[PDB]
Design a protein around this ligand. Structure first.
Ligand SMILES: CCCCC/C=C/C/C=C/C/C=C/C/C=C/CCCC(=O)O[C@H](COC(=O)CCCCCCCCCCCCCCCCC)COP(=O)(O)O[C@H]1[C@H](O)[C@H](O)[C@@H](O)[C@H](O)[C@H]1O
Ligand SMILES: CCCCCCCCCCCCCCCCCCCC(=O)O[C@H](COC(=O)CCCCCCCCCCCCCC)COP(=O)(O)OCCN
Ligand SMILES: CCCCCC(=O)OC[C@H](COP(=O)(O)OC[C@H](N)C(=O)O)OC(=O)CCCCC
Ligand SMILES: [Fe+3]
Ligand SMILES: [Zn+2]
Lengths: 122, 232, 263, 211, 41, 249, 30, 79
């Protein structure tokens, strides 16, 4: 009725490569990368756009097994980005683009493992 | 018309060329006082061919920003912070009225929303504080409450006192001697006679007080503060 | 020397030519432009004979127009665009308050109802953005929502937040610990200790925030230019050449805000 | 206890200093964006190209950064502020996207506005409040902190109250309205040239006495 | 009836739309989504 | 392409224009003694064909900006080598005209890129919706892309024109067909950029700060040279014929 | 207020004016 | 996943000379159900961090009093 902002609030458990748990807060309907952007653990200047063509695995996040069966899978190029812009030309089967993952209301308590930030300047 | 704007643009060109020559001459002499951040505000800002006309007996506050085709009547006061803007159409301000602190008047700039309606203000209209009259005509001898939000097309006729915090909807006339308030403007009661006299009494007292300010606000610049600012 | 004298003469000639050409360009416009002239707006003016007695610790923004007998306590501040018009009756602003941006404070002419009193504001009181206070008698440590429209005769008690955008009607008293808002009185809810802590911390935050605005707004021309040049010089850093040269560049103290205002 | 001091100036000769830098923070106003002389830019406000800020606006972001998007206008007498934090838990910086009309006396504070979001007069957007795109907010609207407006839909009233749903014909008039306001702002922009000639008057008035 | 049937199921099926449209969209566009891909490596 | 990516953008602006001119001058001076005709022309013929094919089919898939510019430069080097493979006066003239046109157009494109470097433009999608924020820079960059495409009413079509004419002068009809196919393919992914910044409007917009007077003036001069070249191309043709004729006598 | 009183800018200014004179002469004398 | 690591974290618990495989469940409190000492609890935590690379930081090592919480924390870890 009153349309509070708190209804579409999604809380996750992003963990830095230093093994520290973080309680991040996002919105339902926007990308997971946007949710990771407010905390600042992912540099906003690197991935300013939300387009798939403008992705080079700089939004790559590692997902636990228990969260991978309740969101749509990699269609054609979500895997291509992983298997192209990586040190090892192989998929992890536990990683997903944070740019393509949209946050749903039921996707609360999700744990995401942000890896070490790769260079993105030029 | 179009030809006048061409000469206005050429005037800008020549004025800026002369200004740049002045800056080069000043800078060649070893002076950089043209780089100050002086507030470039004019209390009677205009456009190409509007040039707001104000009566000499009226009082306008230095913080007031009269812009456009605003016409000011005899004895009316234009207080501090009001943002009277009259670019698109005329904004007639009546004789003996007053526009209080932190008020404003639109002309509904964008022409998309139908036709733009010029703003008309009657005589002895005690416009209230923080009035946001959005291009509505207001007849003489009336009171407008503080925080009112009059919108375009509203005809507030004679003695139509408007309560504080009103949000009278567009194209909704206020009946004579009837108060409208709330969200939105709804009938509350009928105007009484003591308030009828009080409206004109307040108008007269505010006009006299404005005359007093204009007498004291036109004092010379008091160069003591000028020396104080420079010496730091 | 003589070359300097010749260059100064050439500068005078060029200045005169530029001013003449500016005059010609102004004439070609048809004199349809209002000249800029000088800033006639003055803070702390005398209305009839009474001056506003403002304390030394008070921050009054240059855009503000504090006129009439205004008594402002230590530690408080007046922000931009605000108008403390006190022509008729005194406006005793307490110590530690903050009359925020574009706020208006006015006092009735002792005859709005026959028993008019001058406006008074207590201590540690926040008013908010674009509020309208017309004859109120705010007491110490009270919260006023932004855009509030307190009319005459109202008294707000301590810790008695008025909701933003309210229209508190005539002679309406707000009890301590109550939050009143909307066009009518329209009580909402009681106070919470989280909210009292928030009120106190915001009140002290604006006091320890106002001094940087006070200092920046009161810098001389020979000083503001120096700060502008320094800010331009240190706009961006370069660790590469800094390390290669064996040097380190530290920001000047005058370009660093005090740690109390940082999050 | 209150005491006068001679350091007070009863006539600030220089003026208002429209651009107020706070330490390293500087108001980043872009070219071709109209900012009236009465406007006060303080803190870390950023005005983008094609925008316009009208006289009386007191844009200051001394607490958190405030941004104005492309071709988006902030009308006259609009006070915009930012806070350290918001009740919703989101970053408290207020951001105004493209083609957003703010409307006079809109007291924004730590809000968030999506593009094409016409805001009516007397708007009291509070901390953490969000406005989704293609929506219109009627004049006089007030909404408490943590209250959102959904996608294209018309609201108003003293609280955040639904009114009706926008039609397709009327929901495309927002960008045209913002463009028209930008055109009028540009019309004002050409009125005054850079580097005002007040300094000449400074010298003329200073020559009257001393140096 | 035969003319109307074969104006949709002959001319619009095996002559222009569907048959020689293997040269427009989805006929050669996907052809260059494989040939051009396996040339950077 | 990796060198073009990693190197700083001002460096790769200089790394793809100046060195090629000097190396091609060296090759021209060597050709006056490499009169074998069976060791130099066919190798450059094959390398030109391979370069055009690989550039056209490799810049199609590129999503970055500088990688696309590098592959476009490789394709233009192939087209350039077409004119040298003829080994006649008209072949060398087409060679020099193409080199001049390509140098001017590369200066144009890298002026654009350094202009957009202010906000760290990386991918082709960042410059989306540029027709509204900065319409004039949008149309300038579109003209540059069309000049790359060899679209007739611009410079960059005259070079490819006279290159193909020289190629038909020697009777190498296989070169002409490959040139046509590669020109069409390259034109497609050139206009793909125009699509990304005039037609498609993404939800998120990126705003680019204005540039300095140096880049702006160079950009204006190059853009007026490119569009208005086919109205008065005589001086370039005459100077290139004099240069080619001076190579031997 | 009779001399610029800057022993560094004046040489630059005289260099600029002699450069302008040289340019106008080079246009004219050639 | 949790099931894969549960089969291995149950095995290490059998080496404490106090824990009987007949009184262990996926929902089995160390202090209450198993009757383990607080020091025994921290030894169990110590055995858990030697199973793999993660160190089980101090702040989160005091919210695994129950075995299911420990299993969930281990499964939902990047390392
Ligand atoms: C009805 C009227 C019709 C209309 C009448 C029309 C008249 C036409 C007249 C045109 C005048 C032509 C002027 C040519 C203008 C050149 C550009 C101005 C150059 C200039 O910044 O000034 C001097 C420099 O000096 C020279 O380093 C080199 C500058 C040397 C060039 C100066 C030559 C000026 C002699 C002009 C002839 C004198 C004839 C006098 C005419 C009047 C006789 C009565 C001041 O340096 P500065 O360090 O303090 O400051 C500069 C300056 O602020 C900016 O360039 C930068 O921001 C800063 O980094 C710094 O470079
Ligand atoms: C072919 C048909 C189309 C061509 C048409 C040509 C038309 C004729 C040429 C028109 C030229 C108009 C120039 C007007 C005068 C402008 C003078 C401004 C000079 C100036 O401001 O000085 C500096 C700017 O640098 C500069 O302006 C000078 C550097 C400019 C770099 C140009 C390099 C030329 C050599 C290479 C050209 C390419 C050749 C390729 C074959 C400082 O600037 P500032 O004062 O604004 O302050 C710093 C802002 N950053
Ligand atoms: C006849 C007028 C000469 C006036 C000379 C002059 O003003 O130079 C300033 C300008 C630009 O220099 P600034 O950015 O420092 O302007 C600083 C600020 N706008 C100022 O005015 O000082 O020079 C040119 O572009 C002209 C290059 C071609 C010059 C022929
Ligand atoms: Fe991505
Ligand atoms: Zn009043």
């Amino acid at each position: 009725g009153s349309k509070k902002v708190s209804d579409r609030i999604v809380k996750l458990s992003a963990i830095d490569p230093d093994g520290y748990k973080q309680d991040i807060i996002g919105l339902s309907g926007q990308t997971l990368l946007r949710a990771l952007t407010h905390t600042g653990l992912i540099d906003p200047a690197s991935h300013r756009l939300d387009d798939i063509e403008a992705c080079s695995a700089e939004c790559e996040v590692q997902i636990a097994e228990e969260w991978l069966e309740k969101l749509p899978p990699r269609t054609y190029d979500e895997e291509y980005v992983l298997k192209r812009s990586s040190r090892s030309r192989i998929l992890n089967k536990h990683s997903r683009l944070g740019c393509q993952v949209v946050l749903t209301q039921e996707l609360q308590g999700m744990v995401v493992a942000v890896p070490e930030a790769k260079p993105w300047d030029i | 018309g179009t030809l006048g704007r061409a000469f206005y643009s050429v005037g800008f060109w020549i004025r800026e060329t002369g200004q740049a020559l002045d800056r080069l001459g000043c800078r060649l002499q070893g002076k950089n006082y043209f780089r100050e951040q002086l507030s470039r505000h004019r209390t009677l800002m205009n456009v190409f061919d509007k040039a707001p006309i104000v009566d000499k007996e009226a009082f306008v506050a230095p913080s007031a920003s009269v812009i456009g085709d605003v016409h000011i009547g005899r004895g009316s006061s234009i207080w501090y912070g009001c943002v009277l803007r009259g670019d698109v159409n005329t904004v007639s301000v009546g004789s003996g009225t007053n526009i209080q602190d932190n008020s404003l008047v639109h002309v509904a700039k964008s022409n998309l929303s139908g036709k733009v309606h010029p703003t008309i203000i009657g005589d002895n209209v005690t416009i209230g504080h923080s009035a946001v009259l959005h291009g509505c005509t207001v007849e003489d001898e009336t009171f407008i409450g503080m925080g009112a939000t009059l919108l375009d097309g509203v005809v507030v006729e004679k003695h139509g006192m408007v309560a504080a915090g009103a949000l009278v909807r567009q194209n909704t006339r206020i009946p004579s001697g009837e108060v409208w308030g709330g969200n939105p403007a709804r009938f509350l009661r009928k105007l009484t006679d003591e308030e009828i006299a009080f409206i004109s009494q307040s108008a007269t007292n505010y006009s006299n007080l404005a005359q007093a300010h204009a007498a004291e606000n036109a004092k010379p610049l008091n160069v003591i503060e000028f020396e104080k600012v420079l010496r730091k | 020397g003589t070359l300097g004298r010749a260059i100064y003469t050439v500068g005078n000639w060029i200045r005169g030519t530029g001013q003449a050409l500016d005059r010609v360009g102004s004439l070609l416009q048809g004199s349809h432009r209002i000249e800029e002239h000088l800033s006639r707006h003055r803070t702390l003016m005398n209305v009839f004979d009474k001056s506003p007695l403002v304390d030394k610790d008070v921050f009054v923004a240059p855009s503000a127009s504090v006129i009439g007998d205004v008594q402002i306590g230590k530690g408080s501040s007046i922000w931009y665009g605000c108008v403390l018009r006190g022509d008729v009756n005194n406006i005793s602003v307490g110590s530690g308050t903050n009359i925020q941006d574009n706020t208006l404070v006015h006092v009735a002419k002792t005859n709005i109802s026959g028993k008019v009193l001058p406006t008074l504001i207590g201590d540690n009181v926040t008013v908010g953005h674009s509020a309208v206070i017309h004859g109120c008698t705010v007491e110490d440590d009270a919260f006023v929502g932004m855009g509030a429209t307190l009319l005459d005769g109202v008294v707000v008690e301590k810790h008695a937040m008025v909701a933003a955008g309210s229209l508190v009607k005539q002679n309406t008293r707000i009890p301590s610990g109550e939050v009143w808002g909307g066009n009518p009185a329209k009580f909402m809810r009681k106070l919470t200790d989280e909210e009292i802590v928030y009120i106190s911390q915001s009140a002290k935050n604006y006091i320890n925030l106002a001094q940087i605005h006070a200092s920046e707004n009161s810098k001389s021309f020979e000083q503001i230019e120096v700060e502008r040049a320094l800010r331009k010089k240190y706009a961006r850093k370069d660790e590469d050449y800094d390390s290669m040269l064996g040097i380190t560049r530290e920001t000047p103290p005058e370009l660093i805000l005090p740690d109390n205002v940082l999050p | 206890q209150v005491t006068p001091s001679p350091d007070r100036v009863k006539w600030d000769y220089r003026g208002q200093r429209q651009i107020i830098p706070l330490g390293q923070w500087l108001p980043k106003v872009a070219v071709d964006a109209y900012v009236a002389p009465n406007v006060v830019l303080a803190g870390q406000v950023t005005v983008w190209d094609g925008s316009s800020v009208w006289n009386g606006a007191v844009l200051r972001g001394d607490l958190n950064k405030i941004t104005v998007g492309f071709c988006s206008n902030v009308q006259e007498r609009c006070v915009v502020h930012a806070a350290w934090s918001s009740p919703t838990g989101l970053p408290a910086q207020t951001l105004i996207d493209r083609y957003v009309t703010v409307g006079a006396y809109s007291l924004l504070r730590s809000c968030t506005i999506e593009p094409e979001c016409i805001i009516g007069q007397h708007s009291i957007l509070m901390e953490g409040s969000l406005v989704e795109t293609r929506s219109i907010l009627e004049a006089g609207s007030v909404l408490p902190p943590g209250r959102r407006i959904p996608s294209g839909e018309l609201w108003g009233g003293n609280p955040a109250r639904f009114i009706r749903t926008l039609t397709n014909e009327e929901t495309l008039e927002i960008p045209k309205l913002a463009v028209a306001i930008n055109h009028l702002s540009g019309d004002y922009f050409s009125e005054f040239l850079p580097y005002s000639t007040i300094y000449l008057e400074v010298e003329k008035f200073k020559k009257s006495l001393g140096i | 009836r035969s003319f109307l049937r074969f104006g949709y199921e002959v001319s619009f099926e095996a002559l222009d739309k569907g048959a020689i449209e293997i040269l427009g969209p989805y006929g050669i566009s996907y052809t260059f989504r494989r040939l051009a891909e396996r040339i950077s490596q | 392409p990796d060198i073009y990516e990693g190197s700083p953008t001002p460096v790769t602006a200089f790394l793809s224009i100046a060195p090629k001119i000097s190396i091609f001058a060296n090759i021209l001076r060597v050709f006056i003694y490499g009169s074998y005709g069976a060791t130099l022309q066919q190798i450059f013929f094959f390398c030109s064909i391979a370069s055009m094919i690989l550039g056209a089919l490799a810049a199609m898939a590129q999503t970055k900006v500088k990688r696309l510019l590098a592959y476009s430069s490789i394709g233009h080097v192939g087209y350039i080598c077409i004119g040298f493979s003829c080994g006649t006066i008209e072949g060398i003239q087409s060679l020099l005209i193409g080199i001049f046109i390509y140098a001017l157009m590369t200066m144009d494109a890298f002026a654009i890129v350094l202009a957009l470097r202010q906000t760290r433009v990386k991918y082709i999608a960042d410059l989306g919706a540029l027709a509204k924020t900065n319409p004039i820079l949008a149309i300038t960059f579109s003209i540059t892309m069309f000049s790359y495409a060899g679209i007739p009413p611009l410079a960059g079509f005259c070079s490819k024109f006279y290159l193909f004419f020289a190629a038909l002068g020697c009777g190498a009809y296989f070169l002409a067909l490959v040139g046509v196919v590669t020109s069409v393919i390259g034109c497609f992914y050139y206009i793909r950029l125009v699509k990304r910044m005039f037609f498609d409007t993404p939800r998120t917009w990126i705003l680019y700060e204005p540039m300095d007077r140096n880049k702006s003036l160079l950009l204006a001069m190059t853009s007026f040279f490119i569009t208005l070249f086919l109205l008065y191309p005589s001086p370039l043709f005459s100077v290139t014929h004099q240069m080619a004729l001076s190579l031997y006598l | 207020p009779k001399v610029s009183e800057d022993k560094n800018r004046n040489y630059a200014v005289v260099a600029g004016v002699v450069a302008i004179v040289g340019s106008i002469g080079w246009y004219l004398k050639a | 996943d949790k099931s894969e690591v549960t089969d291995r974290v149950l095995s290490v618990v059998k080496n404490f000379q106090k824990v009987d495989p007949s009184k262990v469940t996926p929902k089995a409190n160390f202090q209450n159900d198993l009757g383990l000492d607080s020091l025994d609890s921290v030894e169990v935590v110590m055995a858990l961090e030697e199973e793999f690379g993660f160190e089980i930081p101090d702040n989160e090592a005091d919210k695994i009093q129950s075995i299911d919480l420990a299993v969930d924390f281990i499964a939902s870890h990047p390392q």
